[PDB]
Amino acid sequence: PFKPRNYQLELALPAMKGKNTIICAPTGCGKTFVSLLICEHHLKKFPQGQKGKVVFFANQIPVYEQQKSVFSKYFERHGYRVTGISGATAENVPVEQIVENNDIIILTPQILVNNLKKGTIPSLSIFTLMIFDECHNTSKQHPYNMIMFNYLDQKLGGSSGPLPQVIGLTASVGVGDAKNTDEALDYICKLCASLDASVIATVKHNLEELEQVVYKPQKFFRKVESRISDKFKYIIAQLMRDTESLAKRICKDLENLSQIQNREFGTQKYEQWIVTVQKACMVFQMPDKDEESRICKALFLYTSHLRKYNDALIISEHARMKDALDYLKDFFSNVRAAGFDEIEQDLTQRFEEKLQELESVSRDPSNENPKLEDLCFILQEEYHLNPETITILFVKTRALVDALKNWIEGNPKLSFLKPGILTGRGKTNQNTGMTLPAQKCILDAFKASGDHNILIATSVADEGIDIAQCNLVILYEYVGNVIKMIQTRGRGRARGSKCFLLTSNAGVIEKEQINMYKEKMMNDSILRLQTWDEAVFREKILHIQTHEKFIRDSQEKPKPVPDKENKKLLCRKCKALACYTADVRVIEECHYTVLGDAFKECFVSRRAKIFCARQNCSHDWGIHVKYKTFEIPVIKIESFVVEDIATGVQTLYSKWKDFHFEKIPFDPA
RNA sequence: GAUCGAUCGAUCGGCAUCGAUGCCGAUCGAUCGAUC
Ligand SMILES: Nc1ncnc2c1ncn2[C@@H]1O[C@H](COP(=O)(O)OP(=O)(O)O)[C@@H](O)[C@H]1O
Ligand SMILES: [Mg+2]
Numbered sequence: 209p210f211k212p213r214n215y216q217l218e219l220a221l222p223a224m225k226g227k228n229t230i231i232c233a234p235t236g237c238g239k240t241f242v243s244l245l246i247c248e249h250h251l252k253k254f255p256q257g258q259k260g261k262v263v264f265f266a267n268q269i270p271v272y273e274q275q276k277s278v279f280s281k282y283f284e285r286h287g288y289r290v291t292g293i294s295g296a297t298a299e300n301v302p303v304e305q306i307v308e309n310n311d312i313i314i315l316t317p318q319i320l321v322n323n324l325k326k327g328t329i330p331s332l333s334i335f336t337l338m339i340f341d342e343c344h345n346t347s348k349q350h351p352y353n354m355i356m357f358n359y360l361d362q363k364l365g366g367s368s369g370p371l372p373q374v375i376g377l378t379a380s381v382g383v384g385d386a387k388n389t390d391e392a393l394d395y396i397c398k399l400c401a402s403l404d405a406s407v408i409a410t411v412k413h414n415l416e417e418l419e420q421v422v423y424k425p426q427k428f429f430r431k432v433e434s435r436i437s438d439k440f441k442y443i444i445a446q447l448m449r450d451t452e453s454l455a456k457r458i459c460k461d462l463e464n465l466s467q468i469q470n471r472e473f474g475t476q477k478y479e480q481w482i483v484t485v486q487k488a489c490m491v492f493q494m495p496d497k498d499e500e501s502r503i504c505k506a507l508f509l510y511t512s513h514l515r516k517y518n519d520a521l522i523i524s525e526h527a528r529m530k531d532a533l534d535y536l537k538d539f540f541s542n543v544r545a546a547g548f549d550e551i552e553q554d555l556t557q558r559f560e561e562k563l564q565e566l567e568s569v570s571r572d573p574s575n576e577n578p579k580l581e582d583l584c585f586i587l588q589e590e591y592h593l594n595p596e597t598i599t600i601l602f603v604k605t606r607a608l609v610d611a612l613k614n615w616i617e618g619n620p621k622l623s624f625l626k627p628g629i630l631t632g633r634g635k636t637n638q639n640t641g642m643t644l645p646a647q648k649c650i651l652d653a654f655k656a657s658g659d660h661n662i663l664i665a666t667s668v669a670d671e672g673i674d675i676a677q678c679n680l681v682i683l684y685e686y687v688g689n690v691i692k693m694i695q696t697r698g699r700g701r702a703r704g705s706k707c708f709l710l711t712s713n714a715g716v717i718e719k720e721q722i723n724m725y726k727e728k729m730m731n732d733s734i735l736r737l738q739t740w741d742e743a744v745f746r747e748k749i750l751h752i753q754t755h756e757k758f759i760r761d762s763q764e765k766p767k768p769v770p771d772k773e774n775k776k777l778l779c780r781k782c783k784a785l786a787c788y789t790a791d792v793r794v795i796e797e798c799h800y801t802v803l804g805d806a807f808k809e810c811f812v813s814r815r816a817k818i819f820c821a822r823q824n825c826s827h828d829w830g831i832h833v834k835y836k837t838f839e840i841p842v843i844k845i846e847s848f849v850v851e852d853i854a855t856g857v858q859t860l861y862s863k864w865k866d867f868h869f870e871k872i873p874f875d876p877a
Numbered sequence: 878g879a880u881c882g883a884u885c886g887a888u889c890g891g892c893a894u895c896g897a898u899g900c901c902g903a904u905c906g907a908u909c910g911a912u913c
C-alpha cells in the first residue's frame with residue numbers, strides 16, 4: 209500500500225495523543241491518509257472488550273463516496289465494519305441500527321443533524337472519534353456547527369458521559385471578516401473554539417519534504433482595458449431608453465418607485481433598480497380591474513424587456529457580442545411563442561428594426577472583447593511552451609461557461625484546446641445543471657492522458673472534488689475570499705505552474721492583493737497561536753465557548769403566529785383572479801395544490817406545466833405532479849400576488865414559508 | 878439513470894436603512910417527500 213511520509217506522521221502526532229487537533233496542510237499532501245493513520249491508531253488503543261466508533265463527516269456526495277471507498281479498502285482488512293449513510297440511502301435499516309453495528313461511519317453532517325434533532329441518536333457519546341473533512345466550514349449555521357453545538361451543549365452544563373475526540377482536516381482556516389493580524393487571530397481562536405480544538409498542528413519540521421509533493425504556483429495579474437468604441441452598447445442603450453420612455457409614459461411615476469439615483473445601463477445597480485420597479489409595479493391598486501390589469505401587464509412587459517436588455521449588456525462585456533445577441537434573440541423568440549400582444553409586438557418590432565445592424569456589429573473582428581484577446585494570448589503562449597498543458601479556467605456564471613466553451617471551439621488560434629464543462633447541480637431559471645454521473649464522467653476525461661485539454665468550471669471545481677493536477681489556473685474575473693483564493697490557487701500543484709487572474713476592473717486586482725495579505729496574516733496568526741501554552745489556549749477557547757453558548761441559548765423565538773384570514777391569489781403578470789387561499793391544500797408541507805373545479809378553468813396545461821388562461825398572459829403558474837395515485841397540479845407562490853379580502857394590500861412572497869396562512873392538509877376524500 | 882416540489886446552509890457582488898440589519902442577483906453544497 210502506502211508508506212506514511214515524515215510530515216504525514218508529524219501532522220498525526222498531536223492527534224494520536226488524544227487531543228482535539230486542527231490539521232492545516234496544503235491541498236494534495238495526503239490529509240486523508242493522515243486521518244486514516246489517526247483512526248487506525250485510535251481503534252487499536254482500546255483494550256479487549258471495548259470498541260471504538262469513528263465517524264467521518266464529508267460535505268459532498270462525491271467526497272463522501274470517495275472517502276467511504278478509501279476507508280473500506282483500507283480498514284476492512286483489519287476486520288472493521290465500514291459503512292456510509294447519505295441522502296441516496298434508502299429509508300431502511302434505521303440509523304440507530306447502523307451506527308450500533310459498524311465501527312467506521314462515513315456520514316454527511318445533515319444526516320446526523322436530522323437524527324440528533326429527531327431523537328434517533330440521543331447523544332454524540334456513541335462515537336469516540338469525529339473527523340470533519342474541510343473543517344473550516346464550521347461557521348455561523350453550517351451543519352458542522354450544529355453538530356458542534358450539540359457537542360458543546362453536552363460538554364458545558366448538562367455533563368453527560370464521555371465525549372468523542374474532534375479532528376478537522378481543513379487546508380485554510382480563512383481569517384476572513386478580519387482586517388489586521390489581531391482580528392485574524394481572534395477569528396482563528398473562535399474557529400478552534402467552535403470545534404473544541406487546542407492544536408493547529410502544521411508542517412514545521414519536514415517542510416523541505418512537503419514542498420516536493422505540493423507546489424505553490426506563481427500568481428500573475430492581467431488587467432485589460434475595456435473597449436472604447438462600443439456600438440453594441442450604444443444600440444442596446446438606445447433600446448433601453450426607448451422602453452424606459454414608454455414605461456414612463458404609461459406609468460408617470462417610475463422615478464419614485466425606487467430610490468436608486470444614479471443608474472447606468474448594463475450594471476448591477478440598474479438590475480436592482482429594475483427589479484425593485486417591477487416588484488412595485490405588481491402591487492398596484494385602482495378602482496378599475498380592467499385598467500389595473502392592462503397597466504400592470506404592460507409594465508410587467510416593459511420591466512421584463514428592460515431586465516433582459518440589461519442582462520444582455522452584462523453578458524456582452526464578459527463574452528462576445530454574439531453571445532448577448534443570441535441571448536436577446538432567444539428571449540424574443542421564446543416570448544413570441546407564448547402569445548404576442550400590441551405592447552409586446554411593438555417591442556419586438558422595435559428590437560427587429562435594429563437587429564440587422566446589431567448582427568453586423570457583432571460579427572466584426574474589430575469589435576472583439578480585449579479580455580478574450582488576452583485569454584487567447586495566454587493560452588497560446590502556455591500551450592506553445594508546454595503543449596501538454598491542462599487548464600482549469602475558472603468562470604463565475606454558467607452562461608459565461610457555455611460562452612467560453614463556444615468561443616474556444618470556434619477560435620482558429622485555439623485549435624489545440626479540447627474544452628470541458630463543469631457546472632454545479634440544481635436547476636435554474638435558464639440552465640438545467642449537471643448531474644453527479646455527468647460530473648464524474650467529465651472529471652475522468654479531463655487528465656494529462658487526453659480526451660480533454662481545458663476544464664471550464666464555475667466554483668464547483670475548487671472545494672472538495674478530485675481533479676487532475678493542472679499547469680494553468682487562469683481565473684476569468686473570479687475572486688472571492690481568502691479561502692477561495694487558496695483553494696483555486698491550490699488546484700494547480702504541478703511543478704512550474706502559473707495562476708492568471710484576468711480582469712478588466714481596477715479593484716479586483718486590489719481584492720486579490722488584499723486576499724494575499726490576509727493569507728499572510730493567517731499564517732502569522734497560526735504561527736503566533738502555536739506558541740501559546742496549551743492551558744492558556746484551552747482557557748481562552750473555553751471562555752469563547754461559554755460566551756457563544758450564552759449568546760446562542762438566547763435566540764429561541766424564531767416562530768410567528770399563522771394567519772387564518774382569507775386571501776386571494778391573483779396572477780402576477782395580468783393580475784387576474786387565480787384562486788383563494790381557502791382552496792389551497794398542502795399535501796406534505798411541500799406540495800401546495802389547489803382544491804376546486806373553479807381553478808381548473810383558470811389555467812392551461814402545455815410533466816405538464818400550467819400557465820394562466822387569460823387572452824395574452826401565458827404566465828407560468830405551476831406544474832403537474834404525480835402523487836401516489838393522483839395527477840393534481842401544484843402552484844408556485846412566486847407567480848402570484850396575495851391580496852387581502854378585508855383590506856386591499858397585495859404583499860408579495862418569494863417562497864411559501866414566508867406566506868403565513870392556515871395551511872389545511874390535503875385529504876383525498 | 879432522469880426528474881418534480883419544498884427546505885436548509887455557505888460564498889461573492891450590488892442596493893436600502895440605522896459596523897449592524899434587511900433585500901436583490903449570481904454560484905455552490907446538502908436534506909425531506911413523490912414520480913418515471
Ligand atoms: N504516503 C503516501 N504515499 C503515496 N501517496 C500518497 C501518500 N499519502 C497520500 N498520497 C496520495 O495523495 C493524494 C491526496 O489526496 P486527498 O487526501 O484527497 O487530498 P488532500 O490531501 O489535499 O485532502 C491521494 O490521492 C493519495 O493517493
Ligand atoms: Mg481532502
Ligand SMILES: [Zn+2]
Nearest residue numbers: 779782820825
Ligand atoms: Zn395571468
